[model samples]
Target: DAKKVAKKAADQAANRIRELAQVLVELLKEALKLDLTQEMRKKLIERYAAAIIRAIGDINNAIYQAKQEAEKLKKAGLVDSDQLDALLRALDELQKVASKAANQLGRLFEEALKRLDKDNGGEEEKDRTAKWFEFEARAIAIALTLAAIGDVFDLEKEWRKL
Candidate 1:
């Protein structure tokens, strides 16, 4: 690994996210402030949650298949067994979160957010928008975790210390 990463480059990377996120945040703020009701919100939430769940399912399936390939690679001594185990553990946790929400079919997204909130124990139930964000946070965590795992698995040379 490099001894030092460029701070300017890192700040630029962070800004890319900040820029895109603020645009979304402001857009949602304006829309929700207008006349959004629970029924309408629920309709949107259903599709939003479904789309993310569908994406997570696809990620799960992709990792499962990748695991199968990894197993074969390990057998042939092409993959590191230690990193393989790390991937396995990450995959297990991701699947656990995905399935936990999937099982809560009716109150799907809300239950997961409240469940996580109770476990974490820090929040004021500010608004419906907050709950939506809470759910997005969970989805984002799953996606980002897999993204990290992607690098560890595919770029093993750089993850020697990982």
Candidate 2:
């Protein structure tokens, strides 16, 4: 009998990832319109930086430690642990201030991990790279998450809220 739908293609979560990523994009574009106090912004940025650093570390450690799927994704080159590792760290020190660039940076790093993936000419191999779109989606999440972390103030409030 036919197996019906084998899980070899990518599309389901493609939009989802982009949806979250879109959050990151919109956040930056519409930043400051919904602003916070100076002390709050500063506190938010710093704490946001801390939280982001923590999240990145969690995922990075999970990738190396025992997160399984995350590790598998890295093994398959679905995620670029190196790039994020470097940038987040590079950006981390700056987050002590997490200053003005929060808005500008929102858009700046928002586009960071976006420019890759998609072999859409699927001939039953799900874009050939298996989880290609998923990775893009993952990138969107990570990029959004990382960039949001990089922003510090905004998601600091948002992430902190939830």
Candidate 3:
């Protein structure tokens, strides 16, 4: 029954993450209503899009992990696709939520672009800081990938673009 326990824990983790995601979705909606200037709105919209993308990627990884663990359990003859199917079904729901978020993000980006273009009266605030933030996202992705592969250190080329 240890495997059953493990499956329960994984399902619980997924549920917790889904709760957090709903909160994030609220924040994204609120960002759309802020009294920020056009530029600020554009930047925030970019951040929101990046976040939605990252969330999709996270859910993808979580399902992949659950599938991998399910495969191992099946091979050990400790469980069956019924357990895996439950998890997959949960992940599928998450995927649908993520897809909706992504669609909202696409609409936000379109509106942001229109506003940004309309407000193009002069040189805008430099986005060098934003570039660094993006680079940091890239670095974090690389670090996560390395850690996933059990090689978190000695990634010599990771910092080259930093």
Best by TM-score: 3
Give candidate 2's error at residue 117 in angstroms. Answer: 33
Candidate 2's C-alpha runs over 4 A off are 1-35, 67-139, 142-162
Q: TM-scores of all models?
A: 0.41, 0.27, 0.43
lDDT, candidate 2, 89-141, per-residue tens? 33333332222223333333333323211323333442223234334434545
Measured with C-alpha atoms, the lDDT of residue 3 in candidate 1 is 11
TM-score of 1: 0.41
How would you encode candidate 3's per-residue C-alpha lDDT over 32-65 as one tens digit per residue?
A: 3436587766676676667667655665666566
Pitting candidate 1 against candidate 3, the one with the higher TM-score is: 3
lDDT, residue 2, candidate 3: 28
Candidate 2, residue 7: how far the Cα is off, in Å = 14
C-alpha lDDT of residue 73 in model 2: 53
Rank order (by lDDT, best first): 3, 1, 2
User: Model 3: which residue pairs collide?
Assistant: none
lDDT (0-100) at residue 66 of candidate 1? 55
Question: Taking the tens digit of each residue's C-alpha lDDT, what string does model 1 give over 1-162?
Answer: 111111222222223323333333333443344366767666655654554455445545655665566567667776566766755564454455444433333244445434433544333333454556545644544454454445344444534666
Q: Write the number of the candidate with greater TM-score, choosing between 1 and 2.
A: 1
Q: Candidate 1: lDDT over CA atoms?
A: 0.45
